[PDB]
Amino acid sequence: DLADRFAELERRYDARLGVYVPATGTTAAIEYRADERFAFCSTFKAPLVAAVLHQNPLTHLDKLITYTSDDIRSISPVAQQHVQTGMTIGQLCDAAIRYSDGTAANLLLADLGGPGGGTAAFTGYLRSLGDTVSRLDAEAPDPPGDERDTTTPHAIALVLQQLVLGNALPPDKRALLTDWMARNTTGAKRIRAGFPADWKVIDKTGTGDYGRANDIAVVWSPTGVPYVVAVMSDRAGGGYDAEPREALLAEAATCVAGVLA
Numbered sequence: 679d680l681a682d683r684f685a686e687l688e689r690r691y692d693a694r695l696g697v698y699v700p701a702t703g704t705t706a707a708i709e710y711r712a713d714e715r716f717a718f719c720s721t722f723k724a725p726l727v728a729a730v731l732h733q734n735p736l737t738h739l740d741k742l743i744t745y746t747s748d749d750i751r752s753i754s755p756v757a758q759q760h761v762q763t764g765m766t767i768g769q770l771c772d773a774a775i776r777y778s779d780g781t782a783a784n785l786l787l788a789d790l791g792g793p794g795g796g797t798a799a800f801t802g803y804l805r806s807l808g809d810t811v812s813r814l815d816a817e818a819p820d821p822p823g824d825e826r827d828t829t830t831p832h833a834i835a836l837v838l839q840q841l842v843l844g845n846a847l848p849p850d851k852r853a854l855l856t857d858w859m860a861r862n863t864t865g866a867k868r869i870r871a872g873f874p875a876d877w878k879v880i881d882k883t884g885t886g887d888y889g890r891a892n893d894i895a896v897v898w899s900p901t902g903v904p905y906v907v908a909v910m911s912d913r914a915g916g917g918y919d920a921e922p923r924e925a926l927l928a929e930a931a932t933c934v935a936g937v938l939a
């Protein structure tokens with residue numbers, strides 16, 4: 679029984695854990711706290727890039743964006759390296775997904791445009807995909823329970839499913855998004871750690887205060903059967919400085935993989 683295993687992990691890591699895997703041909707949906715709200719953290723950057731791709735011709739990826747000192751307000755491993763030259767939209771998408779770059783995400787939000795520095799248009803994009811649940815309210819750089827900047831494992835899984843496996847994006851734009859997630863550098867110790875090496879994993883991570891650790895993935899079996907895996911967690915019991923625990927997500931993913939293999 680998965681629910682007992684998930685509950686066991688919650689006690690181990692003094693955590694709240696949310697899990698959703700959408701149903702397939704032969705597997706029922708896996709769900710644990712799947713309709714509870716958890717902070718997006720950086721996981722919004724995957725649908726954000728989808729929004730930017732959708733909104734523009736593909737050659738918009740070549741548009742150079744300039745930025746300066748006061749735009750670097752959050753963890754931005756790539757954008758800090760290129761502040762003196764600027765970065766193209768394509769480079770920003772790359773950084774936002776593969777390095778979870780905060781500045782890159784803010785600039786992409788600004789590119790999408792509109793009220794709240796792009797957060798309203800980003801939320802509008804999710805609504806267009808039938809997601810009435812998620813909301814983005816602020817930029818990089820939220821107390822536990824607060825509904826601002828939250829999604830649910832259920833909602834974000836269905837969004838990722840449409841983006842990667844469905845037809846939310848035309849194939850050419852879909853492949854750009856899928857490739858960036860495939861080449862992600864931040865996810866080795868999360869969902870990836872729970873699935874055997876002969877399963878393909880693409881993902882976008884999220885990490886925050888109050889022990890927040892997320893990962894959203896699409897995985898493929900050795901025979902090419904895809905599954906969407908959304909795992910979210912926080913550790914409110916440790917306060918603001920509670921350490922995020924990647925191992926919680928690795929273990930949750932291992933339990934899921936055991937059911938799907």
Ligand SMILES: *C(=O)[C@@H](NC(=O)/C(=N\OC)c1ccco1)[C@@H]1NC(C(=O)O)=C(COC(N)=O)CS1
Binds near residue numbers: 777864882
């Ligand atoms: C997105 O989740 C974002 N994280 C942050 O910007 C955080 N603090 O600013 C409010 C934060 C808190 C703890 C760590 O960062 C970026 N994303 C990610 C990510 O995992 O996607 C990280 C991850 O660090 C890892 N791998 O442990 C930090 S920056």
